[PDB]
Design a protein around this ligand. Structure first.
Ligand SMILES: *[C@@H]1O[C@H](CO)[C@@H](O[C@@H]2O[C@H](CO)[C@@H](O[C@@H]3O[C@H](CO[C@H]4O[C@H](CO[C@H]5O[C@H](CO)[C@@H](O)[C@H](O)[C@@H]5O)[C@@H](O)[C@H](O[C@H]5O[C@H](CO)[C@@H](O)[C@H](O)[C@@H]5O)[C@@H]4O)[C@@H](O)[C@H](O[C@H]4O[C@H](CO)[C@@H](O)[C@H](O)[C@@H]4O)[C@@H]3O)[C@H](O)[C@H]2NC(C)=O)[C@H](O)[C@H]1NC(C)=O
Ligand SMILES: *[C@@H]1O[C@H](CO)[C@@H](O[C@@H]2O[C@H](CO)[C@@H](O[C@@H]3O[C@H](CO[C@H]4O[C@H](CO)[C@@H](O)[C@H](O)[C@@H]4O)[C@@H](O)[C@H](O[C@H]4O[C@H](CO)[C@@H](O)[C@H](O)[C@@H]4O)[C@@H]3O)[C@H](O)[C@H]2NC(C)=O)[C@H](O)[C@H]1NC(C)=O
Ligand code: HEM
Ligand SMILES: CC(=O)/C=C/[C@@H]1C(C)=CCCC1(C)C
Ligand SMILES: CC(=O)/C=C/[C@H]1C(C)=CCCC1(C)C
Ligand SMILES: [Mg+2]
Length: 335
């Protein structure tokens, strides 16, 4: 009939570096029915047992896992997790697939809600990723070796053979250009415009060993291990401080860009969207998403309504800090 979803965990008691690739969290191969998706972070946590190995977890489990495994900062964890859950999880069972559809998330919600997992395209997951191809080309979740080869190429050209912040700036812009030129459904606005910059610095801030204090840069071996194999480097120690999107601003400034998309189902036809969220108008992202949730859940009642209200509030608690103050919306009133 359903779960009563608890408020998100706070920060971990211990916030320093530590061994995360340890005896209690061994890499193991996929079994039948195990789910993996477009996020190398969650994928690696699932394959080392920080998350359930089947790739289906509660919001609370995702938050604690991203903190324990990578020292992902608490508010950033709350923003990403409840965003993913509101749009893509099952609010009644309190379960989110880190990939595609699975019976493991329980009885489906009323359409047009889906609980289809992080693989679902168009409101959260979107285009111009580093190691995943645009959904237009048929597969938005699998590792793509051609794209990884470009990641290596750009690390060679701009980072001495390593991925660092200079590489991130160049690669991000170049991936946007690829999508403009080849993807007539290319969209780069709202949630995706914001997340696309953060994702490019997560490899630097979270995938580089926390014992590296200076000149933080990711080897291609470590990159392949995580992005392709869902495996922590040997002896991997997490970031020494909670972290998330530090430096994303510099990535944007290296190649200024404006939210938008290819119009009228044509390539090389990128038109700006002045209504989209951007980095000086973050609250629009909050409003946009609450709107999206209303489209998914036009008239909820009972436990679904109750759990929607709670999850929306949980998300707001993170958003309010991360976005620097947003007026809470109450599309379903109060409890
Ligand atoms: C990601 O990874 C990449 C790769 O590892 C990393 O890239 C490094 O980035 C830093 C800076 O961001 C680079 O270091 C800087 O290089 C600047 C450019 O250097 C060239 O030009 C220099 C300036 O020449 C002057 O003088 C000549 C006359 O000789 C004149 O014609 C010119 O007009 C000009 O006025 C020159 O000095 C330099 O040449 C020396 O060094 C090279 C080795 O690269 C050697 O071959 C030469 O023989 C010579 O010894 C070069 O050709 C440079 O301007 C800059 O200088 C500042 O720092 C010094 C040292 O601290 C200060 O004392 C000085 O006041 C300057 O302000 C500096 O050295 C570095 O080279 C990059 N490395 C590579 C491999 O590309 C990114 O940073 C990473 N990203 C992140 C975020 O970490
Ligand atoms: C892994 O991920 C890569 C990258 O996303 C995927 O490969 C891309 O595949 C698409 C579709 O097959 C390719 O797009 C097509 O490009 C053609 C020409 O592009 C040239 O220019 C680029 C540089 O900008 C070169 O890199 C490239 O080699 C080409 O020489 C166009 O002719 C195509 O457009 C036609 O069809 C569309 C669809 O309706 C129309 O809108 C157009 O008007 C037109 O008629 C098309 O866009 C793309 O170039 C590939 N990129 C790379 C880097 O290879 C892989 O599919 C994926 N791998 C696996 C195995 O899944
Ligand atoms: C906390 C909850 C998290 C959620 C819900 C989440 C969700 C997602 C989603 C949906 C994508 C795909 C983006 C797209 O195609 O548009 C993605 C990409 C990514 N995530 Fe996560 N993520 C989370 C945490 C993390 C953590 C902790 C890390 C790093 C340790 C991480 C690193 C990345 C990276 C690097 C990508 C880009 C992959 C690529 O472009 O090749 N994420 N994430
Ligand atoms: C929506 C999302 O996943 C991430 C948002 C970022 C956070 C958490 C803080 C500052 C910059 C951003 C607003 C892009
Ligand atoms: C913090 C920020 O700028 C954006 C972060 C997102 C990205 C990049 C992918 C997974 C996690 C988020 C959904 C928070
Ligand atoms: Mg993507």
């Amino acid at each position: 009939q359903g779960v009563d979803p608890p408020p998100p965990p706070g920060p971990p008691s211990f916030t320093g570096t530590k061994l995360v690739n340890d005896a209690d969290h061994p890499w193991q191969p996929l079994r039948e029915g195990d789910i993996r998706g477009p996020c190398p972070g969650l994928n690696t946590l699932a394959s080392h047992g920080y998350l359930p190995r089947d790739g289906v977890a509660t919001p609370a489990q995702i938050i604690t896992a991203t903190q324990e495994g990578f020292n992902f900062e608490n508010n950033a964890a709350i923003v990403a997790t409840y965003l993913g859950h509101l749009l893509n999880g099952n609010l009644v069972t309190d379960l989110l697939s880190i990939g595609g559809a699975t019976p493991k998330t329980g009885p489906p919600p009323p359409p047009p809600a889906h609980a289809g997992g992080l693989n679902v395209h168009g409101t959260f997951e979107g285009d111009a990723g580093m190691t995943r191809a645009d959904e237009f080309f048929g597969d938005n979740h699998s590792f793509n070796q051609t794209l990884f080869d470009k990641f290596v190429d750009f690390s060679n050209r701009y980072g001495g053979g390593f991925y660092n912040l200079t590489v991130a700036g160049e690669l991000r812009y170049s991936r946007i250009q690829d999508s403009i030129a080849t993807n007539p459904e290319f969209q780069f606005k709202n949630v995706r415009f914001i997340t696309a910059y953060g994702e490019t610095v997560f490899p630097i801030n979270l995938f580089v060993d926390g014992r590296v204090t200076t000149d933080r840069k990711l080897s291609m071996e470590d990159a392949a291990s995580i992005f392709r194999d869902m495996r922590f480097p040997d002896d991997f120690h997490r970031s020494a401080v909670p972290a998330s999107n530090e430096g994303a601003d510099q990535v944007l400034a290296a190649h200024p860009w404006v939210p938008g998309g290819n119009a009228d189902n044509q390539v090389n036809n990128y038109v700006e969207d002045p209504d989209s969220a951007d980095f000086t108008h973050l609250c629009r992202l909050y409003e946009f998403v609450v709107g999206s949730v209303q489209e998914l859940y036009p008239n909820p009642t009972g436990i679904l309504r109750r759990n929607l209200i709670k999850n929306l509030h949980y998300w707001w608690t993170g958003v309010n800090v991360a976005f620097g103050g947003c007026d809470e919306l109450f599309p379903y009133g109060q409890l």
